[PDB]
Design a protein around this ligand. Structure first.
Ligand SMILES: *[C@@H]1O[C@H](CO)[C@@H](O)[C@H](O)[C@H]1NC(C)=O
Ligand SMILES: *[C@@H]1O[C@H](CO)[C@@H](O)[C@H](O)[C@H]1NC(C)=O
Lengths: 111, 49
């Protein structure tokens, strides 16, 4: 009943769509989601890891900042300083109050 | 008609019956419950305006 935003990686692409989707209750993708309606924007471009992101939404734009570093801890955040460079400035034009992340599961445990 | 005003550079494509009163209309068009997207009336013999 409202528009929504969607960002997917495949380890080869970024798929950004601002169509009017109908979502699941456990939306994931198996090791796997495409259904659109009235779609107004579409964008494509190209534990020892840490990747950090900042999302802002103001005056029609969606701002994303990013930085990634190699890390050698177990299950914490490090102590030092590291600044995040800007990534992209998507002109989506919507209202956002909630969000949810997507995972890669092996089987399709659709509940 | 709309509930609250718009942000700068925000668009709104909504097809839902807007309640102008207290009774809830769950997909019912009625009294104090109507359709927000009203059309225009452009005919060539209209005055400028
Ligand atoms: C990854 O998934 C997206 C959407 O599911 C698709 O558009 C893209 O081409 C995929 N990349 C592959 C299969 O390499
Ligand atoms: C999709 O949007 C167009 C205009 O934006 C509208 O004419 C159409 O009815 C919409 N589709 C629906 C509500 O299924």
């Amino acid at each position: 009943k409202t528009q929504s935003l969607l960002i997917v990686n495949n380890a080869t692409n970024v798929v950004i769509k601002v169509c009017e989707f109908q979502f699941c209750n456990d939306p994931f993708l198996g090791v796997v989601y495409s259904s659109a309606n009235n779609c107004t924007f579409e964008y494509v471009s190209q534990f020892k890891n840490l990747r950090e992101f900042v999302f802002k939404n103001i005056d029609g734009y969606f701002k994303i900042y990013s930085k990634h570093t190699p890390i050698n801890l177990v299950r914490d955040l490090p102590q030092g300083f590291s600044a995040l460079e800007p990534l992209v400035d998507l002109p989506i034009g919507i209202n956002i109050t909630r969000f949810q992340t997507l995972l890669a599961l092996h089987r399709s445990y659709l509940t | 008609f709309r509930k609250s005003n718009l942000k700068p550079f925000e668009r709104d494509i909504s097809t839902e019956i807007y309640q102008a009163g207290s009774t809830p209309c769950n997909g019912v068009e009625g009294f104090n419950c109507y359709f927000p997207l009203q059309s225009y009336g452009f005919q060539p013999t209209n005055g400028v305006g």
